[PDB]
Design a protein around this ligand. Sequence first.
Ligand code: 6F3
Ligand code: 6F3
Ligand code: 6F3
Ligand code: 6F3
Lengths: 120, 120, 120, 120
Amino acid sequence: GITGTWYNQLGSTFIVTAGADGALTGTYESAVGNAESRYVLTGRYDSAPATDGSGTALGWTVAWKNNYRNAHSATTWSGQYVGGAEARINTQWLLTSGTTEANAWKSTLVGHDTFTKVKP
Amino acid sequence: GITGTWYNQLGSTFIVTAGADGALTGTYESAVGNAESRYVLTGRYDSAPATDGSGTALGWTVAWKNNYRNAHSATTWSGQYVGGAEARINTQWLLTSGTTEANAWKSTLVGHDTFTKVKP
Amino acid sequence: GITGTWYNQLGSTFIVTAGADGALTGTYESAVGNAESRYVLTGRYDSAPATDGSGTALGWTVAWKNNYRNAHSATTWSGQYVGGAEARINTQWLLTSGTTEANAWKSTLVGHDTFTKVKP
Amino acid sequence: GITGTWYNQLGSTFIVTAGADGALTGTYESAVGNAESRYVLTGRYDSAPATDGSGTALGWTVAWKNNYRNAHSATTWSGQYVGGAEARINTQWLLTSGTTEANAWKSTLVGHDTFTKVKP
Ligand SMILES: CNS(=O)(=O)c1cccc(-c2cc3c(=O)[nH]ccc3o2)c1
Ligand SMILES: CNS(=O)(=O)c1cccc(-c2cc3c(=O)[nH]ccc3o2)c1
Ligand SMILES: CNS(=O)(=O)c1cccc(-c2cc3c(=O)[nH]ccc3o2)c1
Ligand SMILES: CNS(=O)(=O)c1cccc(-c2cc3c(=O)[nH]ccc3o2)c1
């Protein structure tokens, strides 16, 4: 299942609990960027996925403020959990920084992260 | 200035509380506002934004399952709140559907929503 | 319909020709209108769109090198032309910069541009 | 290093010439290897990249019409070429379909493709 400790291809650590009500909660620790130690995450998942072989849709958000640092930014991951002997969560993400209006056209980075239960 | 009701460009509504802890919690629904159109949302925002004129970074997730309906998908919105008399939340979003691996390349839609406090 | 001079919401100027073969060719520049701000574009469009009221799919690329400046980056716009009283091109775009592998996670910006044949 | 035949992670074949003028020209075969599956591509690349370990920025478009078929859609790939013994083109893509205005919110898929010089 989704609940567990996951790592992406960059070595970031995603510690998540999937609640019976569809909630995702936990912490995220980035291996990259303006980031130190753990950040709160919250999100949602489909708690009754299709039974036709499809993955389980989910998403979560981290605002990159904690007691140590504040990057004035937030990332959302949108993806699906795919069961198997090598369980994986495949995502794409949007990282939006707070900007002035003049800089808003460059406010948002996009990428893709794949998570498994092992580090790189 | 984030707490309250916001409206997008297409007759959808959300309703959010921005907690002191950086949490976003509320509901996402239709203009119609019927039970079957309402879904839980959760996310995060920067509770200590820059004071240089920059927007406030935020994001949230809705999984498209409620007690009535299940689309087996989730949307994440990543964006920034821009304050004023003409307050706005400018977002980009990712909507991932659960798929089989053969169909994964087509799992994710992208788009953009702008929210205002004024019911349109 | 596609052939012409288009302007995005930020005042960039897109001078395009839609060839009978599906080709898009032209230049992309900034409002100030200097030679040093002007770059080659190439792309493709659906030369035989549906007849059911749908828009016409298209895309183009600008690499941000000209005889004066090189940003070691490229933008692609993907979207559709919507004909009628006031014709419009609605796009989303990806801007990739050359990075080292360690920085590749932050190589790509995403946004959305709308074009009309009038200035904003 | 860009000119040649490339293969993505899903069996498509990207046949490209990188011109001295920054042009990308070629064919994309969504298949192995029939005429009905071949489409024109055009795009642009940084013809004077850095030699500091950074990738070479680039992008291209396919409109999914040929003499046999027409999906009324176009993909743009935005990314970077990374040279060396294990050369890659790492991309993110946007696939826009022509839609009605009512369906425009769901016009654009996003994903990622990695291309190699050896068949996967
Ligand atoms: C906003 N400034 S920053 O330097 O770019 C920044 C700050 C904090 C964290 C991230 C970060 C981690 C992280 C990850 O693990 N996968 C994808 C995206 C990504 O972004 C990026
Ligand atoms: C009444 N709910 S619904 O029709 O079943 C449904 C199902 C899946 C998705 C969306 C939906 C809305 C919505 C939006 O307002 N911005 C971005 C994405 C997005 O997706 C709505
Ligand atoms: C790293 N290259 S760059 O400095 O970011 C650069 C240089 C010149 C022009 C643009 C540019 C214009 C432009 C636009 O009109 N719509 C979307 C994206 C976009 O990018 C970007
Ligand atoms: C709406 N058009 S379509 O039916 O979905 C269609 C038809 C033929 C080929 C593709 C296609 C291949 C392909 C690829 O290799 N990477 C990225 C996107 C992408 O799209 C898409």
